[PDB]
Design a protein around this ligand. Sequence first.
Ligand code: ZN
Ligand code: ZN
Ligand code: ZN
Length: 572
Amino acid sequence: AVGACVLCNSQTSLRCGACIRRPFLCCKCCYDHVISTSHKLVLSVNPYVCNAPGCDVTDVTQLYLGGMSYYCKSHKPPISFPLCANGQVFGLYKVTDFNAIATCDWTNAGDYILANTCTERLKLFAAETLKATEETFKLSYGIATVREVLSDRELHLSWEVGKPRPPLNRNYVFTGYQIGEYTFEKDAVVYRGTTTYKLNVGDYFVLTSHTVMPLSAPTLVPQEHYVRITGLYPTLNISDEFSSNVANYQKVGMQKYSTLQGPPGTGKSHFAIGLALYYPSARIVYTACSHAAVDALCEKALKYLPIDKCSRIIPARARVECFDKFKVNSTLEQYVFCTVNALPETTADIVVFDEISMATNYDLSVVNARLRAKHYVYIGDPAQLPAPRTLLTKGTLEPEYFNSVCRLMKTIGPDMFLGTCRRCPAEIVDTVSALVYDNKLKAHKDKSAQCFKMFYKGVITHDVSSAINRPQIGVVREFLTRNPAWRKAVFISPYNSQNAVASKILGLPTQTVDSSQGSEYDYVIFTQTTETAHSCNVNRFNVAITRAKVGILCIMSDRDLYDKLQFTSLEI
Ligand SMILES: [Zn+2]
Ligand SMILES: [Zn+2]
Ligand SMILES: [Zn+2]
C-alpha cells in the first residue's frame, strides 16, 4: 500500500477502492475526489471500513479513527477524529478532470476530449480506465454455439439468450473453443478462422478480453531540442531519390521526437525507409498498431534496405498471415519491424511509429515503456481514420482528440508536412486538399478525366445495423457494362454488408473505407450507401477517394460531399 498520487505525486497509503483502476490518491486530493463523486471507498493496507462487528459502513465521510482502528458515527469511541475533515482523508504522509475520467462510462465524445486535454498522468489514468472499461464490456456479450456446418467457409449459429448479440465484422475477433481466434460475416453466415479447423458443432466461441496492464511511461516523452544531430551519423552520398527529405531527416536528429503529417500518397513509407539510408549506422525499430501497417513498411524496406539486418517480429500467438521475407523474431537485427502489442523490451537510435492516427494514448504509452530511443518519429495523418472506440456512441471524436500526437499536429502543427501527392488524379487531390488540408496538399499527377460522381440515394436496407443499398450496386453494374476498363476496380463502401452484396452482384474485390486505409488501387468504385454521420465522416471520405491512382466512381447519397467532389458528374 505504498505509492505515489496519480494527481500531484505526493506519496500516500490511500487508493480509491471505487475506481476500476484503484489509483493512489494523496490526502488533499483523495478528499477532493470522495467529496465530489459517488466514490466513497478509500483503501490503505486495511480499507477504510467500520471495524465494529457486522457493520457495513464503508463510506470514508461517515468514518472516524478510534485509536488505530476505524469506526462509523454509530460505533466510534468518545475520542475519535473524522477520516474526512479539513480538506484531507487521514492516512500516511499527510482534480475536477480526474473525477470526470474516474466516473464516466466512455460512451460520450466529451470523455475522450478530456482524456486528451488533461495532464500527462491523467492521460495514462484515462487510457488505463478506458481500456479496462472496454474489456469488462466484452464480457457482457453472448456465447455463439455452432448449430450446423454447411461447408469450409459457411455455418449456421445459435446464440446465448439474455446477452446481447455482438456486431459481426473483422473489427470483432472471437476466440474459438482453445481452437484459435476466429472472425464472422453474413441465414447463411461465413466463418473465418485464423487457424484451420474442421468446424465442430456445439463447440462455442467468446471475445477474449485481454487483461489491461498498467501504464507507466508517458504518451509523449518531454521534448528536447538539440543544436546538432545527436547520436546519429549521416551520409553525404545520400541517394537522389531521398534528396527531398534530407532537411527533414536532419530535423529528426535535432529533436527528441518529431511529427510528420503525410496526406495520402505523399511519401510516408518512402520517408520512413529513407531515414535508414540517411543514418545508415543507426538501429531503427519500425512500429505501428496493425500488422498491415508494419507489412507496408516491410515492403518498402525490402526495396531499399539490406534484407539480412531486417527482422519481422511475430508474436507466438500468430493471429493473421503477415510479412514472410525477413528473418522472424530476431530482436537484435538493425531493422526491426513489429506491431505495438508485440514490441520487445529493447533500445534504438531511432524509433519510427507509423499510421499515428490509428494509435490510442494507451498504444503511445506502451511504445514509450517497451522502447528507449535517442529519437522518436511519429508518421501519419490526423485527416485519416482513427482507432475504433467501441464504447463511443454519442458524439463525433475530432482529429485533435485521436491521441497526443494528433492533438499536437492539429494545434501547434506537424514538425514536417509532405505537401505533394504523387498517387491521385488531380480531381481527387483538389477535392481532399480543400476538404481536410486547408488547400496545402498539391497534385503531382494531372487530372486523369476518369473521376466520376453520381448523385443517387437509392434504397437503404439494414443487415442488423450495417447498411445495404442494392440500387447503388445496380447503378455500378450498369456502369461496368458501359465501362469495362473498370472491371479491374476495387469496390469500396463504409459498410461490410454493402460490400458483401456488391461482391456477389459485381464480382469486384471488396473493401471497407477503414480496411482500405494505407492501400492504393488503379480504379476505385465507391458507394456511399447512406447519408449517416458514419458515411459522411470527412476523414473516412478523404480515405475513400484517395485510394485511387487512376480513376474513381463515387455513387453519393450526401448532397454536401457530392457537391464538394471535383469530378465529372454522370446521369442515370
Ligand atoms: Zn495528490
Ligand atoms: Zn475513484
Ligand atoms: Zn459502524
